Amino acid sequence: SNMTYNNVFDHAYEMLKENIRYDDIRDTDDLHDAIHMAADNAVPHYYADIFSVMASEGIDLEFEDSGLMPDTKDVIRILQARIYEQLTIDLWEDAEDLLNEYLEEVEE
Amino acid sequence: SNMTYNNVFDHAYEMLKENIRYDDIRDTDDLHDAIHMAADNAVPHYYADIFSVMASEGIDLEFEDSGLMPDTKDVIRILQARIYEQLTIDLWEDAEDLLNEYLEEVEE
Amino acid sequence: MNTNNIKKYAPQARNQFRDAVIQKLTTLGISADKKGNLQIADAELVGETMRYGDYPKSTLTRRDRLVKRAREQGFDVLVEHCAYTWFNRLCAIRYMEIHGYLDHGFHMLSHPDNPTGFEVLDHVPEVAEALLPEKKAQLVEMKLSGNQDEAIYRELLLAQCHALHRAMPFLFEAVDDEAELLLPDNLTRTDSILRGLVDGIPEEDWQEVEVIGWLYQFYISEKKDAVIGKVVKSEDIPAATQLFTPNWIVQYLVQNSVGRQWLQTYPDSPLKGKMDYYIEPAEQTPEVQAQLAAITPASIEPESIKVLDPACGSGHILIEVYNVLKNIYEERGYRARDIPQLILENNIFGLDIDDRAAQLSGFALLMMARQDDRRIFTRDVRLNIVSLQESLHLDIAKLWQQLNFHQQNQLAHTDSAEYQLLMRTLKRFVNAKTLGSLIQVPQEEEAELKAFLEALYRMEQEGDFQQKAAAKAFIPYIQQAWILAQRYDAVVANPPYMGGKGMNSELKEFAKNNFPDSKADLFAMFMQNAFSLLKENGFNAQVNMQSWMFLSSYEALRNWLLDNKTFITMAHLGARAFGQISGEVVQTTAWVIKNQHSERYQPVFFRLIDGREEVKKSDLLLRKNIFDKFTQHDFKNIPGMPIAYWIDLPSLLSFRHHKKLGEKIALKAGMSTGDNIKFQRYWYEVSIKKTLITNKESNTKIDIHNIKWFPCSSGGEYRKWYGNNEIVVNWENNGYEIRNFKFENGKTRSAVRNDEYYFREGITWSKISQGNFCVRYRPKGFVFDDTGRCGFSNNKNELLYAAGLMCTPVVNHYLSILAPTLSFTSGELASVPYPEIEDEIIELVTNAIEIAKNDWDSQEQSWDYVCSPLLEHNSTQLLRNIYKQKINTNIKLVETLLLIENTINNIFIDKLQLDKTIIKAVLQSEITLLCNPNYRYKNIQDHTDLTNKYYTDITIDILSYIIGCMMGRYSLDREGLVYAHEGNKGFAELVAEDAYKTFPADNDGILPLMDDEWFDDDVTSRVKEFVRTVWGEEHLQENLEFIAESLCLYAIKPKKGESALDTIRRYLSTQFWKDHMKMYKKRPIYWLFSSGKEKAFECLVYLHRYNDATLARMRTEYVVPLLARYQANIDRLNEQVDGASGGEATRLKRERDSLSKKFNELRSFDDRLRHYADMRISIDLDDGVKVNYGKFGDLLADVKAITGNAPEII
Ligand SMILES: C[S@@+](CC[C@H](N)C(=O)[O-])C[C@H]1O[C@@H](n2cnc3c(N)ncnc32)[C@H](O)[C@@H]1O
């Protein structure tokens, strides 16, 4: 029941390439949503898979921002939250690259 | 980097057999501490091992009692908390058995 | 060579030298604001001392030639150039003291027997005897004081550089007074910039010459990553486009270009013996063979050949051209010592805009010639490696009468051909630092420019102080212009790579006015401009990005190439060809194109697209993967004319004989709404009465005034025959909202295209498809946008015949030729072959479409949804035996479509006269059905873990339907969708029509999703009531026990002794909300309200069935009645902890503890539901689900997972 976070970032990264193209996002001031959804849609759903993601490289177990952390008795939501946050952080680190790649993809 | 919860309950179960014998606990009204320590001393310490425990049978990912859940940005503490609670619940389910086993172990 | 020492040092050495020039400028009086603005301060005159911020008075005229340059150039511009140039001057001394090229022979920057000293400090008189003969007795008396070692080391190093001004004037100048003032101090400290140059680069790294190229690349490495993404300034171009080509590519280029002409004249030239990268001209037809021999000269003099790199960079390419001319002169029989002078003068010419890429280039070539001629340093050696210069700063009239050309002073002669030719050339190079070698010059001006350039050289040495300083400024322009006017036998280069969204305002308009066919990137502009610099039989050989080979934006160009030029040999490299770049941002190809047209010519291709750089170098020397079977006239038969050497024959000949697909099916791109979050919705977000979906249960006329949402084919994921029917758009009043939707200024924002084809029958595909290609059937009543392009015919047979094709691998065989990308637009796909209509395919497609319609319609997300596929069999059979029945059914359906798809493929293969070896048939894991476990679960490879996964989604699919029945969305009595429109209107009229008499639809629409049975209309309670109601009280327990087995497989984790009923209640209150989130794509129709995270009260609410007073009833009959139960049970549990001792009293405490924390949460959820319920919030379903979900603050669950924004608490 294995699944790597690098696998998960790849789906999320690809989600955002689509999300930028389907909405014609141009400046980063309008990129926030496309990044959040791409991350949420990439989080694994099974307990077996979610643990597998955590155990992998590219994600740690200490959050950054309490607000994104459900104060909740449901730890699968928490581990599921921690993967969301990590995905969003990494995605923004490629935001200008993609906005440049999607802006630079028509040339017409 | 595998480690089962049933492995962990066995250490905890054995911790409590010792704890009852080292303090001469007789009625359950004085068993609470010995059970709590046995659980805490059995929780794994490495991230690799703690995830391994969760993925196993005998423990779920939804807590029972918020107070035992550190409202904390440190998820290894949380997963580490969830294993504590599960261990304590199971141990109490054998409390009268052991108090009977330790009371019934001298016969002198 | 350890580049790592260089790669680490050179970028840091760039910043060491820059900051060392900035702190020498602060005392010089030159600085800039935090952003960048120049400053001066006249200068203080202390008798004969100028104190700027402290300097002699004779250093003032040479200071005000620097205040000049800054005002016209810039503060961040001069630092970068002068820190580069001195770093260059020193690395050249570092290189020349290790190779003992100094005539005095002592180490000039380090000490052989001392890691921290300087050898010219110990031999002060020897070093001065060679350099400063008259200043010895003065230098001898300084080192005899013992404390001025920093002042002595400086007098010598400059005396070394003045000495180097004669033989290398491009790097070391003499009355370069301005320069000597930016030479830093502290050259002898333990922290001098110099130590890093000796300590950061081991002496081994200095042996070869390419180090010059590694210094070259790594120095500018840092400023590159900043100048990327934005537009590149005219001053930052060399940074943003500077690479370093692997040696093995340059050899292929120079040897398949320069060496080719010498070989074409002297066929048995042994030259071929060195070139290992020389490709052998494919067997040409004896006619072309006879054509080529009528043009080649019978003899070529080695010193008449003339080669030109317009963008040398490190000169890395010129070093190879120097090497191959070296074996032409060694084969021709010239003295070893006499060769360097004749090459650098007669044969090699170089250009670039980076003044400093030309400094290094000429040194690398002069270090080539010094490695072979010890006395080249003494001869007057003019190098044709100059940097291009601007002319917005010239005192034109001062220089033409300082020239005194006609010797007028013992504007006269403005009708003289020296003034008319002078002014015509200074205007071509107005923005040379920006245009580069792209500014053309006619060959007619070669003779005139050259004759005047040599006269300018003449009066630079035979003139006085006025004519010498004057002509010295003029030569840089006349020379580079003569270079451009000259026509060459070969032009090799690795041109710069820069897209139009990095090009600047000046460069864009020059690209539009001079390079229309290749305005896209600089590398195309170089490819085209080089042909205008070649003799008739000249060669053009570059290494470029590969896109010019396939993108239709270059078809204009690829046609220009195939008709006037000739393809000789190409090496197609692809990705990761350069081994010092990260990111899949790079793919490349090299080639050689002759400047003559030969139609019948047969070019040789090498497909080296696989492996790392190392892999391709091996496979090239080994001539692996060759394609020599297609001439440049054969590429004219593939629409768009894509270089596609890798083709086969029958696929080439299918293009000439059939009609194009486009000629028969109207491929139409859809609209562009202008806002996908405002105008587009999932068909379930809005009313079913407000959508143009013909329901099976609404015979009341569809009022086309009331219709606001219309289904829209919006591309989607890979799917072969029908699916992706999910997206509805706002097309009310024929698009009155989308057509008039303008920007805030008035320029129209939306792009309603082909609005005539709307509502029609046709086929659709995913314009943006990562993998293969495929179309789908698309019945009447659809609109379509740009993400989902649709093709229409009037003939439904031709529409179906095209449908079955456009899903075959045969089409993905053609779409790989016309353009290898992800974009399946309307240009390349129109040119696909399309054979006569065979009728056997039209029936295979219709069987195919209905199988894919039936698969799609089986999900509750399809409007053509009927009922749960479990309700098709006998209700007396055990339910766990009904799962086995439906898994065996779903696998037969896959083989039925697979045999239909492969028969369509292999039929199209026979008609189009193709090869079945090339076109692989369709495999099982490629059937685009949702009942096919090999396509729906691409991740899990296993078999037992692939089975259990499928068991779980089926379990979920039937659970979301029992809840759908409960909410009133479906019914056992009525087939299809039942209630689904805004504000719970008309639900009561259906109850009096016995619409749900079999399984009752819940009373309020509030289903308590709790982890204990408190209510009777609780979800779990009703699910048990559902299985008893369908599969019999006889099988209730075998059927229920089996639902707990399938849920704990993958969805959740088991517990010991957790009854089958508690197992289903556990999934619901924990994992179902997750799965319904996933199941409707975060746009749920059953919203989950949550008291908190204790789960003190959770309940499901049907989106459609919501009105103002819903929150009121949730509080009246649920939140209130539950708090009087909690109290009535907490007082009964406080009676019980006391009455227990032993192990049981402990057991009851943990249950009063978990129940009390749920009383405070529900008390803090009630005071917040008392706030939002008094508000009587009313929703508009049209607003979407993202918008409504945030109106309720934190009453709901996952408000940020859904809305994206956190919950606005109140
Ligand atoms: C050829 S590359 C540099 C790497 C080079 N291939 C080498 O072997 O070292 C691009 C260089 O030429 C410059 N350049 C840009 N446009 C130019 C032009 N029209 N003519 C000449 N050089 C140009 C760039 O600024 C950059 O300095």
Numbering used by the authors:
A (entry chain B), B (entry chain B): 3 to 110
C (entry chain A): 1 to 53, 56 to 412, 426 to 1225
Text from the published report:
The PglX N-terminal domain encodes the methyltransferase, whereas the C-terminal domain is for motif recognition. Our data demonstrate that PglX is used to recognise specific DNA sequences for BREX activity, contributing to motif recognition for both phage defence and host methylation. As a result, the PglX structure, and lack of nuclease motifs and potential aligned catalytic residues, supports PglX acting as a methyltransferase only, and not acting as a restriction enzyme.
Ocr is the T7-encoded restriction system inhibitor that blocks phage defence activity of the E. coli BREX system. We therefore concluded that this heterotetrameric form represented the solution state of the PglX-SAM:Ocr complex. Six salt bridges are produced between R79, D35, D42, D62, D76 and E109 of Ocr and D1213, K1201, K1097, K1070, K1110, and K516 of PglX, respectively. The complex is stabilised by a number of hydrogen bonds between Ocr and the C-terminal domain of PglX. Also visible in the PglX-SAM:Ocr structure is a bound SAM molecule, in the same ligand binding position as seen in the PglX-SAM structure. The PglX molecules from the PglX-SAM and PglX-SAM:Ocr structures align closely with an RMSD of 1.34 Å (9564 atoms), suggesting that binding of Ocr does not elicit any substantive domain movement. Collectively, these data suggest that Ocr acts as a DNA mimic, capable of sequestering PglX and therefore blocking BREX activity by preventing recognition of target DNA.
